[PDB]
């Protein structure tokens, strides 16, 4: 049981408002981002000093189960443990279930809203169940951004849709599913990151729409999620000059308190987006950011660049009258309500609670991919060829970030059985690559995501290649936004599209490419 | 946990099943298997195990996953399973989250100038490998490789060998075994009577070693003898034609070799194991049913990865009915398996037993890398540049098989801080890439391994590149065999070499290029 709020020292009270970043991996030498990911000594130190929570990235599901156990064992007050599991727990932690991205659910909603809503609830339910199984009690999802700017590099297919109705129905469905379990759900990124071409990881975007438009498009999904009892709302780092010309949302009383806490009447946790993000760190110094975020009405400071300095800077602000001690305890009260909800769970323990091979779950994933697929409407199929006669050219945003490419994955293995030998390159390399002229299939895995300056635009190079060699077909996995241009520029070339990049998504698309039955890999290791 | 039942109490089918070791993935779920053609689904595994299969060999999965897997597999077994993996380069080579060591040849490199130290390090490697294996529930370590890599073109062994001479391999191989013997796990000498002198990978085709008996006892054999005298528990045979010993049959199928040379002449009393029976070298020789029967007749105790397990069991029963095999022959092997399983008899302790950040372990890895490293013999630093002005070209054998390239890994991150933007390509693509002429650093991760037709040979393309663009330097991780050619062909280009490919090995080398990132997701 939680201790009374009053029993906390002021410094423990402040520490409760802070959530710090770890890696899912057990050991220091495994951190991919040691600049942002606390080592073990620092993590134990922070937790023993009363830090409120931890956000985790990286590691297999089994590792994470082991990690969250270790972290909680250090905590006197139970930790909130969060992850950006927007596409199933398996998106982040391998060995749990990865769902297709939210926009696939949106695609289905267009022609079959009732089914799409059902599937989205199943996604929420399963996400929540698997999260608890790993010791993750805080789901940072659903994304409620409305992606109405097709050039948005950061949100893109992470959004449930391009209109407020669509996004509202699917986002709330997800929340209803997750509400079967005791986990916090999180609406992001208030008041929505949908219409911009700029990634707030890189720079501070400005959304220039007026108050009426914000209430017409950006807001409705947030209002619905708030009425539906979402536990937390995460803000975007964005300039919203209709509301504030001075501060971005993260630092803006007008936005965090005026719009969210006051006008929309949101009673739950207001959480900053990550405070190490370029959008915010280019705006003000770390100590200024934490004090102003609190004053603007944030309950949770997510990933402050300097945690030890933040605590001291907050103590200092209190001693000078810039912040009040009572203000801190208002956030602690809210955090207590949230932690009370997650204490409620009966323990679930890995592998128990993970869907794995469960037919119902695997069929859900398959169905979503299948109903959201698109392809050029023509009868033509990709040709089979003798062994190693043809080329299967796989193009990705980054090789480092393509976990879906694994030995003998279906996007490789299947065309291989039709005579297409695999070659993997990054899009930025492709223009300078001299392709041998032999029948070639091109599969592009390209999508928006955090740390994308602009969406990949394959069309120009595809067109150049089509003129150089016999291009048999093009497959897109991920973002749909260049299909129109593909069809317009190269109508003679057949194309297929899926929202998913995972093995099962590859298998569905690739199997549909060929009329002939597969021919004849010897490799076991 | 009870004692093993008498051998005689197994039914004939259960006795046969004990001789078979089947392949599985360390991943918990069927949909995760990279190789569903070779890795049994959970339903099949449970059936085989409940019917009495002798053991499972595992590939893939995080250390944490493997620990769940082996727990599940043992729960289905009435007789405790042998659980094997090819953890040659530390447990971490296979299952991420455990300790990955540099490859054996790095230890051989050290032995050249400092044998006493190399041996201490090799013992630590064996001890740590065994300790971590046990914490995952892996009781059978298939290592050390005792092959002597005296053919520099060998594509399959290469840096997996502790050295190029028998003295060197014997010393380091036995030290690894002594280390492993601090724990109760089986060790395995591979691949008898040594796969070192050939340019052919027995995964793709059947090699022939043409040496006479005298030469075999002079070069190939001595490390095997020393391992055997040192009490190694298992000896795995190569699929190889050794025409001096047997003219019809490769070692796997040959009575003269397995029984005559190994069991009898060398007096080896432990498990005689076939190399994987799904390998091209053996499958191209005879049909599956013929292979398992003839391997038993030759003296094999363990049939590793038969292409058809159910068919193999039938075939062996049929061969007993026909008199080609005798029933008692099967029980002779079960008896040896009992000796082995008795040694390892008992719940996996993970993370307890994993080294992790333990300073001693981390220092052993870093020290092996540092001492085995090779450099241009002068001291050289390379220019820095403003952001994205230069190019860091990372060249690999295969992108799918480069687990050492991870987001923000040092080979990428370090040059990036110096103005070199990363570009990653596979070696076979490189000749067709037209490079911009801007300062360029090239890093090649290239080595021998299973399923390698021939060693990667970058020299010609590096030469063409060096004439086109301003090459700042070249780094090699992996195989050391193309260094002479590099220095002769491009004497003016600075180069660095490490045996290790992992993050720490990248950090050491890249840091030295100069000293001598906003993304969080």
**Terminal-to-terminal C-alpha distance of chain A:** 50
CA distance A338 to A362: 32
Number of residues assigned to chain A:
525
SS3 B332: helix
Residue A390 has phi, psi (to 5 degrees) of: -105, 175
Resolution in A: 2.2
CA distance B98 to B62: 8
What secondary structure, in 3-state letters, does A174-217 show?
HHHHHCCCCCECEEEEECCCCCCCCCCCCCCCECCCCHHHHHHH
The two structure tokens encoding residue A110: 């267009």
In terms of CATH architecture, what is B373-521? Answer: 3-Layer(aba) Sandwich (3.40)
What secondary structure, in 3-state letters, does A458-515 show?
CHHHHHHHHHHCCEEEEEEEECCCCHHHHHHHCCCCCEEEECCCCHHHHHHHHHHCCC
Comparing CA positions, the residue from A69, A72, A79 lying closest to residue A19 is A79
* Cα angle A421, A427, A430; round to 5: 65
Q: Count each helix (H run) and each strand (E run) in chain A, helices first.
A: 19, 14
Spans of all domains in chain B: 2-372, 373-521
Comparing CA positions, the residue from A434, A439, A399 lying closest to residue A415 is A439
What is the least distance, in Å, from the CA of A325 to any CA of chain B?
Answer: 32
Distances in whole angstroms, Cα of residue B273 to Cα of each of B160, B190, B238: 19, 9, 9
Number of residues assigned to chain B:
521
SS3 B393: strand
CB B46 within 8 A of CB B54: no
Q: Which CATH number fits domain A373-525: 1.20.120.1200, 3.30.70.260, 3.40.50.10870, 3.40.309.10?
A: 3.40.50.10870
Query: Is A67 annotated to bind ligand?
Result: no
CB B280 within 8 A of CB B250: no
The two structure tokens encoding residue B285: 């020789």
The residue to which tokens 């408002």 are assigned: A17
- Put simply, the answer to whether A95 touches B30 (Cβ < 8 Å) is no
B65, B407, B436 member nearest A32 (Cβ):
B407
CA distance A303 to A281: 12
SS3 A130: helix
Q: How far is CA A513 from the centre of its chain?
A: 30
Residues tagged in the binding site annotation of B: 86, 160, 190-191, 203, 275-276
Query: Is A84 annotated to bind ligand?
Result: yes
Class of the B2-372 domain? alpha beta
Task: Tell me chain B's radius of gyration from C-alpha atoms.
Answer: 24
SS3 B454: coil
SS3 B338: helix
Sheet holding A186-190, edge to edge: A186-190, A232-235, A269-271
CB B434 within 8 A of CB B403: no
- Taking the domain A1-372, which CATH number applies? 3.20.20.300
B278, B407, B425 member nearest A401 (Cβ):
B407
What is the least distance, in Å, from the CA of A228 to any CA of chain B?
Answer: 30
Query: Is A273 annotated to bind ligand?
Result: yes
Active site residue B147: no
CB A286 within 8 A of CB A304: yes
Check residue B7 and report its DSSP letter. Answer: G
Comparing CA positions, the residue from B98, B41, B39, B43 lying closest to residue B65 is B98
CA distance B486 to A445: 36
B chain contacts of residue A405, beta-carbon cutoff 8 Å: 399-400
- Put simply, the answer to whether A405 touches B406 (Cβ < 8 Å) is no
- The method of structure determination was X-ray
* Cα angle B433, B437, B441; round to 5: 80
Peptide bond just before A223 cis, omega within 30 deg = no
DSSP A362-403: HHHHHHHHHHH-EE-SS---PPP-STTSEEEEEEES-STT-T
SS3 B70: helix
Helix (H) / strand (E) element for B308: namely none
CB neighbourhood size of A205 (10 A) = 21
Q: Which of B147, B195, B203, B301 is catalytic?
A: B203
Distances in whole angstroms, Cα of residue A180 to Cα of each of A87, A132, B94: 18, 12, 38
Check residue B357 and report its DSSP letter. Answer: T
What is the least distance, in Å, from the CA of A155 to any CA of chain B?
Answer: 14
The residue to which tokens 């492709």 are assigned: A430
CB A524 within 8 A of CB B276: yes
B chain contacts of residue A25, beta-carbon cutoff 8 Å: 97
């Amino acid at each position: 049981p939680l201790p009374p709020v009053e029993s906390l020292s002021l410094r423990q009270a402040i520490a409760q408002m802070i959530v710090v970043r770890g890696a899912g991996y057990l050991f220091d030498y495994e951190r991919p981002y040691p600049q942002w990911e606390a080592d073990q000594t620092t993590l134990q130190r922070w937790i023993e000093a009363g830090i409120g929570g931890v956000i985790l990235l990286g590691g297999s599901a089994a590792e994470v189960a082991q990690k969250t156990k270790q972290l909680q064992s250090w905590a006197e007050i139970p930790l909130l443990i969060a992850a950006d599991i927007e596409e199933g727990v398996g998106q982040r932690f391998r060995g749990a279930t990865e769902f297709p991205p939210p926009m696939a659910f949106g695609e289905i909603w267009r022609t079959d809203p009732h089914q799409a809503i059902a599937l989205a609830e199943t996604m929420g339910a399963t996400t929540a169940q698997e999260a608890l199984s790993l010791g993750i009690n805080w789901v940072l999802a659903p994304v409620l951004d409305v992606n109405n700017n097709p050039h948005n590099p950061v949100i893109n297919i992470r959004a449930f849709g391009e209109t407020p109705d669509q996004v509202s129905a699917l986002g709330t469905a997800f929340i209803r599913g997750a509400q079967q379990y005791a986990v916090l759900t999180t609406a992001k990124h208030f008041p929505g990151h949908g219409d911009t071409a700029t990634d707030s990881h890189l720079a501070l975007p400005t959304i220039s729409h007026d108050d009426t438009r914000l209430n017409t498009v950006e807001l409705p999904p947030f209002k619905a999620a708030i009425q539906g009892g979402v536990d937390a709302v995460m803000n975007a780092h964005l300039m919203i000059p209709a509301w504030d010309q001075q501060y971005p949302a993260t630092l803006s009383p007008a936005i965090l308190t005026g719009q969210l806490r006051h006008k929309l009447g949101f009673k739950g946790l207001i959480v900053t987006d990550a405070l190490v993000m370029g959008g915010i760190t280019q705006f003000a110094a770390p100590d200024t950011v934490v004090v102003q975020a609190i004053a603007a009405g944030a309950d949770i400071l997510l990933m402050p660049p300097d945690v030890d300095g933040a605590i001291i800077a907050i103590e200092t602000a209190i001693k000078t009258g810039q912040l009040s001690e009572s203000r801190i305890y208002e956030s602690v009260e809210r955090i207590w309500q949230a932690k009370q909800k997650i204490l409620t769970a009966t323990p679930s323990t890995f592998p128990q609670g993970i869907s794995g091979d469960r037919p119902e779950t695997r069929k859900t994933v398959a169905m979503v991919l299948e109903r959201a697929t698109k392809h050029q409407k023509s009868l033509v199929k990709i040709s089979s060829f003798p062994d190693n006669f043809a080329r299967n050219l796989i193009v990705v945003d980054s090789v480092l970030k393509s976990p879906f490419l694994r030995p003998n994955c279906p996007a490789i293995a299947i065309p291989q059985r039709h005579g297409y030998a695999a070659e993997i390159v990054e899009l930025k390399t492709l223009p300078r690559l001299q392709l041998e002229a032999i029948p070639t299939l091109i599969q592009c895995f390209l999508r928006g995501n955090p740390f994308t300056e602009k969406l990949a635009d394959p069309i120009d190079v595809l067109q150049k290649i089509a003129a150089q060699i016999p291009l048999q077909g093009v497959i897109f996995y991920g973002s749909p936004y260049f299909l129109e241009a593909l069809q317009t520029t190269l109508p003679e070339i057949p194309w297929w599209f899926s929202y998913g990049q995972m093995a099962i998504a590859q298998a569905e698309i690739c199997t549909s490419l060929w009329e002939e039955a597969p021919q004849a890999a010897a490799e076991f290791i």
